[PDB]
Amino acid sequence: NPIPTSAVLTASAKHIGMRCMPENVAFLKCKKNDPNPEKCLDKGRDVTRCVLGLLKDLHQKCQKEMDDYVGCMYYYTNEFDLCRKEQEAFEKVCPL
Amino acid sequence: PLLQDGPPPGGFAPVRYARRISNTGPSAMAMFLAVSGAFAWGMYQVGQGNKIRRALKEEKYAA
Known part of the structure; x- marks a missing residue:
């Protein structure tokens, strides 16, 4: 449901970095070999679909505790150390 | 006037x-x-604080 904006993606990067690891590694290896966007096209959809699935899962499982996290991250321009309150409120319900 | 100013006894x-x-x-x-x-x-406290800030910056970059 959420649009993959800057705030949501930065907020959920913690969960992306442990569930999207193989797809991200594959895309990075593909991009390193050749800079062609055309050649990296096919691997550029696997990561997109897996990240969107993760965002859907996080939105459904952690609904109220993620909207406030995204709102505060957008408010403070993605600075983790400032608030952090909705942060632990977020991994409290999402177990990562 | 027999009452001149002067030091006390x-x-x-x-x-x-x-x-x-x-x-x-x-x-x-x-x-x-x-x-x-x-x-x-x-100086020791400054080193510890710089270590903490480095950890914060590296986790921000890891994000």
């Missing part, structure tokens, strides 16, 4: 004029030690 109270010195404040190596120890402890 027994004279006036003794006074001081010899430049009493208070000698206030820390003395000798007290300030030097208090500054050197503060400098060392503060």
